[PDB]
Nucleic acid binder design. Sequence first.
RNA 1: UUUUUUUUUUUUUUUUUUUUUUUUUUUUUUUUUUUUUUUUUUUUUUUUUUUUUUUUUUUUUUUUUUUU
Lengths: 422, 422, 53, 392, 189
Amino acid sequence: MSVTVKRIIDNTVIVPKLPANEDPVEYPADYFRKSKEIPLYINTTKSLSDLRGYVYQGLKSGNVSIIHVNSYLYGALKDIRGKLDKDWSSFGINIGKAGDTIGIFDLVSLKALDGVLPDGVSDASRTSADDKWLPLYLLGLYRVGRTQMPEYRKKLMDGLTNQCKMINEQFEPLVPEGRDIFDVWGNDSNYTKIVAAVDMFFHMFKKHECASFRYGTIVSRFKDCAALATFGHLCKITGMSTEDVTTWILNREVADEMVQMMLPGQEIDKADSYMPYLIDFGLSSKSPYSSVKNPAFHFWGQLTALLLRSTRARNARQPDDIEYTSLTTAGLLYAYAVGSSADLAQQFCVGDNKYTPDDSTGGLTTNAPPQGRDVVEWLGWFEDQNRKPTPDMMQYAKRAVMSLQGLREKTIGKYAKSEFDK
Amino acid sequence: MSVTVKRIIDNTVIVPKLPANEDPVEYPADYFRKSKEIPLYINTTKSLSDLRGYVYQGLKSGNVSIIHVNSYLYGALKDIRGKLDKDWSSFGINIGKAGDTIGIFDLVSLKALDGVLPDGVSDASRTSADDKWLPLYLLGLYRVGRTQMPEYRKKLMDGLTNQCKMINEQFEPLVPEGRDIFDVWGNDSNYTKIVAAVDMFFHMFKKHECASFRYGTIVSRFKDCAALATFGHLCKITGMSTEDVTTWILNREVADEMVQMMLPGQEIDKADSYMPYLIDFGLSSKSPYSSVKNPAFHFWGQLTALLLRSTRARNARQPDDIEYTSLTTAGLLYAYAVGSSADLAQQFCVGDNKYTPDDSTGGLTTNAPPQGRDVVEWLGWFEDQNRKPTPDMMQYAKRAVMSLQGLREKTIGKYAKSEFDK
Amino acid sequence: MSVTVKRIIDNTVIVPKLPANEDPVEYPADYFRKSKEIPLYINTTKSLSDLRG
Amino acid sequence: MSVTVKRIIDNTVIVPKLPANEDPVEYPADYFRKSKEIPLYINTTKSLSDLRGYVYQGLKSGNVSIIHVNSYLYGALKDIRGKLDKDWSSFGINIGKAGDTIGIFDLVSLKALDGVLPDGVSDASRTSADDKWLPLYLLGLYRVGRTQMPEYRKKLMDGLTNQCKMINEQFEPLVPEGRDIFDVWGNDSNYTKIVAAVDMFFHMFKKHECASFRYGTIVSRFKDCAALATFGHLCKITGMSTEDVTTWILNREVADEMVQMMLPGQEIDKADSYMPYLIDFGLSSKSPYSSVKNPAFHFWGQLTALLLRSTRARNARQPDDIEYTSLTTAGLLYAYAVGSSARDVVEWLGWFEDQNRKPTPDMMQYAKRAVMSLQGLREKTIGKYAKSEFDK
Amino acid sequence: LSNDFFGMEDMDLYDKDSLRYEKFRFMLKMTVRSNKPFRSYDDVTAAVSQWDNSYIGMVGKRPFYKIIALIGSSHLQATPAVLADLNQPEYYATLTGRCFLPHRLGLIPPMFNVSETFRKPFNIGIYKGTLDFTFTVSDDESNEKVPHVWEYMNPKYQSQIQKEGLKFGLILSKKATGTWVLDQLSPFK
RNA sequence: UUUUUUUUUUUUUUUUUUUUUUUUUUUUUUUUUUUUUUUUUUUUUUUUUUUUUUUUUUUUUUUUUUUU
């Protein structure tokens, strides 16, 4: 317990604690300490051609089984090709050694699924034209069946069809117009493991001949990690370094989210690691890096980036059941600091010519912005205003939020236009 | 007793004690000290197909027996599948150990029901496609039979129908439009034990292929724990640390309510524990976290959250036979403290740049809001305002309660609009 | 690591790090230290006339 | 004790004595009187190529064993070459005699380690290109791991990589960027003995072909001897003689620290001796010349050098829990005497007593001039303390 | 042994195998899942004998846990699911009571009233599946006379307890009176 | 007035830094310059909830309708 609370009628302790309304965070490091592999359960007791017929006729009839599609995806993606150049160690697992050819499924442990295999709709007229487009379509269905919105789903389906025609160019659509059965595919653990493994393998091998499979599996990259996405967007939209941005966090609730966000043993800064797929691989059942688990930090980052005129921070969904006043005030303060006082400081010197004129009327104390990016200077300036937003700050917010046509409901843009456009 | 009580005509004691109008609280820890297992009485002297026919024809005819449905639910939910990654010890009960597969009923002790088995309406034309969707429907009726009002029960039934149709795709509805029988199923103890065990098992294994069964049993999670849920909601809406919130509670009944609410040996902070099912498993006949046993804190927290513009705290039923003046004043004081005076303090620093200017005319004694979040300082301001809330607090309440169209009768929103909107 | 950030509630560091949304840079010198050649994979089991046709 | 202390209720003696919270100083002369050699325990039951592969793959995988690296360092540093010219006797040990070839480990006694040898991950495809750059890297990862600060560690790693790349020119970095395992190497005793022996051998033979090994092992020279280093810095930055500066010290704690520092039988004024490695060779577990066993004199000398405009005396950290006012007064007196009088001690003491022991405003102005305009002072150091107290 | 090295004289408390009686009450729960029904009780012993392939449980009760596993395998009654074709055959057996086991395993440490579950899949070739256990072996200081432990197996099964009881790793012998005394477990186990 | 004994709603003991791996302390360095709610069956108290989510962001690489 951080501190102690006394019941003052007799000086007794009560040690208050939150209820378990939401599951606690789980980190991939703990999972990989528990087990040293990622099990992938599949039923490989069928020929590749028979499995391809199964999946083709199931997609055409809209009654394909997840076990059949998983087994076929394993069977058609055994491309050991792809030669590493550097070591690919991650989370204490030796994926490869800088030169040995590696397959897609060499980075996840493979087991045998224990269950009953469905009968199937086996066909024999399908030739060996599977690897060209069928795994691509099957993986694209995974990304398509996550939008839950007709317009975006239709756009994604059209993009997937175009990508498949890029390689096959005949491609009569397989799944019927209705009867969306690929929605359930995301629930299955093995399918998510397969799609995440494919995504990471083709992210390591960008220039592979089958890199087109990255379509429909890119959603697995950094899945359920909107907090890190918004933190990177904030760090890139302000120009301010992360090591100095992290000092600007306030409201004392962003603090806990930031602290649980940056535990050392996660290597969240390593691209070729298991961190982006902490939930699809099953490493973490509850992703600590999500937006629901980190609502305050997500809201603050999106609002701040919106007040800095960023095209991304206008559609992020505004979280619920969080204090909005303090977060809005902190975001407005940081955004005004970024967009009002450009740093504009000498960086590199040729031997000499480094300093600044301090004796040339260095007036500092006045009713003006501190003309810098130090957090305490702005904090002192704001306290000199007795903790209320000056009308210049509100005018800056209004100019940064006005002309935001086509806003989206429940998003940060609509909330800012309702709040910072009085 | 607290201390002695003397009536001064003869210097005699009265030692008053409250009548047992309402049953005293019961904690899960006491039950688990009394017994080291959770018995489940079922009648297993029947085949799975016969029980499936029994329950199918009973649901179709609207006269299914509770023993038959309990036995069939046991028979169809013997899925030992689900591999634990970590230990699942709870209340000194070793459910599993970091790698051993466990079933739904591996976490509840199983016995033999002592009674006569009803005859049944046995059918033989129903194949073994039951585990996919029939336990889902049977558990969904449990949640459906708690609304007690058609305009919500219809939506719940439609959701259950969609949930089952996503699996079976035919699903002609079984229970007739009227003639409910699933209302009584809540009274039975074994049915509640089974449904809560299913809920907790599928909560531990979220990514299970049969995780859809969580529909209809999610209501068992934190059942009759409205006080704990509203405490968590209050701690999440105010943004203040969960331990500083309990320092703010007043009125002398909320304190004792809190003390009985969080006795240390109850394990209310662990998600994968037996605590959220203290009443469905039979661990406690009267849940101390209920709203009927904890009216004052529920009312005060819901009112505070409503004053903080929370969409959740607008439908909670206003408790009866409690004070509506002291609690309302305390909630208004808390809301004005948190929603007006944002903390907004420096959190992270790089070596230096920590403090605040205390020599820049840091006056304190003024007729202004304290501009802080400490309970003692706001309390000092309030008592300097002779415990009569200022009209600015009324204006804040009016702004936070107005525009709340479509309120619900007997709920917190209606009372707030009738009280804080004079 | 340039400078350290410490949390003023308990005097604890946090070592913040940016996410790898964009892949890190790779330099040609690093590759040429890794390998001393540029492999070009082709299939030469065909005559020039056949391939041009 | 010095003189008796009596309790006047019955005229009884108590002989007060300080508790031994900090271990008493140990001197190299005492150790060399106890034993006439410096043992070095290694496991030589492996081929040189096998040990080379062991250490190479351990560094690459970041799971190397200290026994294997010590054994390989012994195997690859048997360069008996290097011809002496003058007698190299030290602490009554005949290391060499004016014209005999000498090796690195010739100056330390060698024994056989008693223990179990780890497995090893040997790679058999490594040629005999080890002695050129690998021992240098292994010795440099001791100094690199002795920093415990990211910026200094990064700079030292860059310098070590530059030094190594001068020899082989390929040098793919071996230790992984994360999980630094070489910090533990300093804990072991035999590794420190080897690194100190290498440092002293290449300090005597400056113009050796393999003199580049001095990188990383230079930190072993005068290790935990900051008090003697700051005494030399004070003697050099003032131009005043060492026999005359010792009279100026005051406060009666600096006097005791000098007394314990200046034992005659320590030969602390000999460069080619075992003294600078009194703690790496294991001669003394608690060096009397350290800055923690001699905090008062270290603080006083650092402050005095700072007030005399020395760039060195602005990063030494302030010693903890020692009386500062008297030390600061003595340091200010010495600094003003040096900076205003281009030096007798009793004359300045009488001059100060004419002020009944209170610094004059002129001395505070001199200190202000000597401490003003010190940009980028790092925390807890003498510069920060002087800027806080002498720059009012 | 003494023929090999110097100075391994035995203690004077128990000479080599001083026989002693250890009265103890117990409780047992069992659940054996398999792909096919067990044709013979010998296959049951084969499938249960590896219940402690990776042993985490008690040491002072390990022989007692083995004998309780034997008694549970003896009384492994079937279930309605074991019929022609319903599902995988699931077996069940539970026993509770008190008994005393004559054994020559030396003095046993004092046992406590603590329960330990056991789970382990078995692979005896033709038959797949897992197990389940819940022992409650603990001391009984009451003078109340208890039935002989080996009596808890009905004579209907176990035509030769000398080997049916040895399938689990035990080594049996006869006290020349009709009471079986436990010599020791499997050697070095 | 009192049953006798009592007299910290004082106490397990030992403690007394939210001090401590040791060694350190130039974020110096290769070397060399009968009663009386016309109350209640019980449990209830978001006409909240499948889970995971939070851009109608994303094939990778691109960022002069620049170039032999």
